[PDB]
């Protein structure tokens, strides 16, 4: 399922809380080409080991911040990280990247979502939609 030696860390007070065992947590895994020091999003510096790594964080934003640090602040750029959502029951949901291609570059087979066929100035007036559970952008 989820495999990888955890990075050598001394432990900090900024880690997980009861939400991890009550609501959900997040896992980030990546392949490191050398055991080297990186920065915990929760505070402190830890060494990551050669090969597989696996880290548990409390928020998706922390996982993506770690991914950004891995992609930007290392000359052997780490582009292979994967972010999953881990539920208390045991279900693991693959989150990032969605289809294996980074969202920055366009990839075929994606579906447009939230796209409106008009411009921002063409939204309906509120008075024409009042007393209905709708908003001008929702229409």
């Amino acid at each position: 399922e989820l495999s990888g030696q955890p990075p050598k860390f001394g432990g900090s007070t900024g880690g997980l809380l009861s939400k991890a065992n009550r609501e959900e947590k997040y896992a980030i895994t990546w392949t490191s080409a050398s055991e080297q020091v990186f920065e915990m999003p929760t505070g402190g510096a830890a060494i990551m080991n050669e090969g597989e790594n696996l880290l548990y964080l409390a928020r998706k934003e922390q996982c993506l911040a770690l991914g950004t640090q891995l992609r930007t602040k290392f000359k052997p750029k780490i582009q292979d990280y994967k972010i999953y959502r881990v539920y208390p029951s045991g279900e693991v949901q693959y989150l990032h990247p969605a289809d294996g291609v980074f969202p920055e570059k366009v990839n075929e087979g994606r579906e447009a979502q939230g796209t409106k066929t008009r411009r921002i100035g063409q939204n309906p007036e509120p008075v024409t939609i009042k007393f209905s559970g709708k908003a001008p952008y929702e229409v």
């Binding site: 001394g10 432990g11 900090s12 007070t13 900024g14 080297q36 020091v37 990186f38 920065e39 505070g43 402190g44 510096a45 060494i47």
Partner: peptide, 19 residues
């Protein structure tokens, strides 16, 4: 720079900052 601060006093400060 986190690279030059591993298990030194600065890192330990950054670890129990919540406490």
């Amino acid at each position: 720079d986190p690279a030059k601060n591993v298990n030194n006093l600065l890192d330990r400060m950054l670890r129990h900052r919540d406490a």
